[PDB]
């Protein structure tokens, strides 16, 4: 907690304004993934950036495998950062696992989260009886095996699929941070995400929410955005980016920045 947590998770506060925005990165990146959208926000907003404890840019000996076996422990870190910074109200932009973290955080502390922007967002990745999440159990078992048997080969193959569009600089950048993650931590985060099911709690979210949908995301079927819009408890809209990929902040930052400026205008 406190100043030590601000140090350990590389917390940075840039820009200025009464509109505070937290940018929270996803699996396989760190806060540098926001570097190209950041200049579109800092004239108008006070921006809080931090690294998840699993990021390769954080000393991996801080990663407590027992503590971080659920997403609520990541929520605890986020809340402790905002409390240490004395921030009473903010908008939160979360990618991937951070979209799940933001949902949970907005339920824990509805006073603190005035708006959510969710990128690469899903409440559940595994398929269920009448629910298409995009993944089967046997498929993820093989992914987990590949991550353990040869993490470098797995990451080399995953990076272009996650970026989706043929944007070589974005593949190189995502690869860099993926290869920066300790393989056991990377596997553990993925296992934690795949066992999370937020469907039942979506109606507890009170904050307005913008769900950013790209034209294809290897981890998020197109139908998930409509599910989130139907079930999130706040005023929710889906904003459609005119390109593909799981990491639009890396592959199409100027387009994503348009959505962010609109979504962060008033809250």
Numbering used by the authors: 52 to 318
Question: What did the article's authors report about this structure?
Answer:
Strigolactones (SLs) are phytohormones that control many aspects of plant growth. Despite their relatively recent discovery as plant hormones, rapid progress has been made in understanding SL function, including the identification of a signalling pathway for SLs. This pathway involves the SL receptors of the DWARF14 (D14) class of α/β-hydrolase enzymes, the MORE AXILLARY GROWTH2 (MAX2) F-box proteins, and the SUPPRESSOR OF MAX2 1 (SMAX1) and SMAX1-LIKE (SMXL) family of chaperonin-like proteins. The D14 α/β-hydrolase enzyme uses a Ser–His–Asp catalytic triad to perceive and hydrolyse SLs simultaneously. OsD14 has a α/β-hydrolase fold with a seven-stranded β-sheet core domain flanked by seven α-helices, of which two are shorter 310-helices.
The structure of O. sativa Dwarf14 (OsD14) was determined by X-ray crystallography to a resolution of 1.35 Å from a construct lacking the first 51 residues. Inserted between strands five and six of the central sheet are four helices connected to the core by a β-hairpin loop on its N-terminal side and a shorter loop on the other side. This domain, commonly named the helical cap, forms a V-shaped lid over a deep cavity, which is assumed to bind the SL hormone. At the bottom of the cavity is a canonical catalytic triad consisting of Ser147, His297, and Asp268. After model building of the protein, residual density was observed in the ligand-binding cavity. We identified this as originating from MPD, which was used as a precipitating agent during crystallization. MPD was added as a racemic mixture of (4S)-2-methyl-2,4-pentanediol and (4R)-2-methyl-2,4-pentanediol, and it appears that both stereoisomers were able to bind in the cavity. Judging from the electron density, there was a preference for binding the 4S stereoisomer in one subunit (arbitrarily named molecule B in the PDB co-ordinate file). MPD is located some distance away from the catalytic triad, forms several hydrophobic interactions with residues lining the cavity (Phe78, Phe176, Phe186, Val194, Val244, and Phe245), and hydrogen-bonds to the hydroxyl oxygen of Tyr209 and to Oγ of Ser147 and Nε2 of His297 via a water molecule. In the second subunit (named molecule A), the binding of the 4R stereoisomer appears to be preferred, and the direct interaction with the Tyr209 hydroxyl group is replaced by a solvent-mediated contact. The helical cap covers MPD like a dome, but is open to solvent on one side in this conformational state of the receptor.
